[PDB]
Amino acid sequence: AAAQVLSSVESEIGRTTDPVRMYMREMGTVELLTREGEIDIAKRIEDGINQVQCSVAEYPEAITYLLEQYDRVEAEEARLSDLITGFVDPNAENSIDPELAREKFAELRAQYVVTRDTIKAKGRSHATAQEEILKLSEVFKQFRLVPKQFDYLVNSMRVMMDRVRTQERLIMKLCVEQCKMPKKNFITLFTGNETSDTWFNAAIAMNKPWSEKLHDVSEEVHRALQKLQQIEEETGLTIEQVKDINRRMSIGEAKARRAKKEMVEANLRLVISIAKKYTRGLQFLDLIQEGN
Amino acid sequence: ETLRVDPTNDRLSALVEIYRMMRPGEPPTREAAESLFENLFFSEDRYDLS
Amino acid sequence: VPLDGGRFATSDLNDLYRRVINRNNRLKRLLDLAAPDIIVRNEKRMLQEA
Amino acid sequence: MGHIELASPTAHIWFLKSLSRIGLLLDMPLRDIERVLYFESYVVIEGGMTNLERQQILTEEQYLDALEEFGDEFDAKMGAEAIQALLKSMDLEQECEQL
Numbered sequence: 384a385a386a387q388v389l390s391s392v393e394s395e396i397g398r399t400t401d402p403v404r405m406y407m408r409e410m411g412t413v414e415l416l417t418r419e420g421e422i423d424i425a426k427r428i429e430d431g432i433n434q435v436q437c438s439v440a441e442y443p444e445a446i447t448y449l450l451e452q453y454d455r456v457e458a459e460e461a462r463l464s465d466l467i468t469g470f471v472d473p474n475a476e477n478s479i480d481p482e483l484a485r486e487k488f489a490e491l492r493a494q495y496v497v498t499r500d501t502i503k504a505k506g507r508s509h510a511t512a513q514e515e516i517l518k519l520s521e522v523f524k525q526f527r528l529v530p531k532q533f534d535y536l537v538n539s540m541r542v543m544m545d546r547v548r549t550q551e552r553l554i555m556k557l558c559v560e561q562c563k564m565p566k567k568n569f570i571t572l573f574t575g576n577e578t579s580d581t582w583f584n585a586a587i588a589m590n591k592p593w594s595e596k597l598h599d600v601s602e603e604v605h606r607a608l609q610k611l612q613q614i615e616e617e618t619g620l621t622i623e624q625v626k627d628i629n630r631r632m633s634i635g636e637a638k639a640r641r642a643k644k645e646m647v648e649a650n651l652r653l654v655i656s657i658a659k660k661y662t663r664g665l666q667f668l669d670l671i672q673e674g675n
Numbered sequence: 676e677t678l679r680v681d682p683t684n685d686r687l688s689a690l691v692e693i694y695r696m697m698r699p700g701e702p703p704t705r706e707a708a709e710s711l712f713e714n715l716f717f718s719e720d721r722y723d724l725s
Numbered sequence: 726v727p728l729d730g731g732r733f734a735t736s737d738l739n740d741l742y743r744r745v746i747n748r749n750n751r752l753k754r755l756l757d758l759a760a761p762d763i764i765v766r767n768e769k770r771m772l773q774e775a
Numbered sequence: 776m777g778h779i780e781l782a783s784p785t786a787h788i789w790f791l792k793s794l795s796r797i798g799l800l801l802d803m804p805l806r807d808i809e810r811v812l813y814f815e816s817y818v819v820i821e822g823g824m825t826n827l828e829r830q831q832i833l834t835e836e837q838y839l840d841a842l843e844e845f846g847d848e849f850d851a852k853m854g855a856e857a858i859q860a861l862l863k864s865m866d867l868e869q870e871c872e873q874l
Binding site for chain 1: 695698699700701702
């Protein structure tokens, strides 16, 4: 309840124009943890990290993205470029050697093909096909890459989901706003097929005279369908799985950000203590900001 | 007549008001007000008459 | 302007311009870094004061 | 002459401290303007509900209740850009015909 005394201090301030004491008063609410807060916050960060690892796990093309660039330098007779640092670098619970990079890749090529034919058997949701996909993820899980190339891997999902979200919005941009498409049935009909025109002409089967004269705008409402199905074909992943991918990656990254936040303010007193020995070359607050 | 205008009743409130007086905005604590008031006129380092 | 003795001297306006630019670029760096709002408020106060 | 591109909009000091020219236009207390400037007190840009009201002073604790009650329905934020948005939203012809 450290903010309750703020309701009595701020409401009765002398309207002080010194920013430094406003800064201290604002960060004085937090407390100093020890021996449990650090460990708990680190655990809450690492679970978010491995949640992100699971987020890159379900993408079929990310595993191929790990390898095609190394195939560019594998045939070069030497990989002196810095991209060799962004190799798998497996975790053990150093210069990259062929006895490690290629040995780790020996099973990667096998998993690249053993998970293809099994998926076609007994549909995509087949038990052993899905566990083989999970194993192909697991051989990806035993890696420890660098954040440089990794920083684009997360955006490889982020831009894709942004594209699908914009395509979904485009339907409302084109017809729902002007033609007053009631979302009560649209949400149910979109999740039914989302591959063909079963619900689109089911909406013609119903009375819906607003949608009856859709022939004037037929060739601009189904181009969104064309693009969505094109995304489905090129990505090779169904819309059912990508939403689950984005649903649980967002919560993981938000949890990691929240865990970092809950800790950073707890250690501002170290910064404010260490900064003041270094003043006066620049200022009294710019030092604090840079220390932050 | 001055006691009729004084809004403090004891040492703690007086020191809180004095801390708010010298250092407005900063929330007062139990020991900071005492230290500040002692340093105002009872610290050899920060006060002298010759 | 350089002086004769290999020295320099400049108007204080140059110092203020440097001061505002130094924290303006820092504020730019505090957005992509996803700074906590508590410190972004402090940076914005720094910029306003500058 | 050159220009400096700022990330967060900032308030001019002449039309703020001198007398007010930013307070008279907004019909707001000068002290509350400073409180909002220092990122201490929120302002209601738009109240979708009848509980809130345009140009209301808000403390952080009192603002948490608004967050847990309504959220997206109202528009209340922090900083000088809130004042800029208030200036953008207000209309002076209506004040001319009303006052």
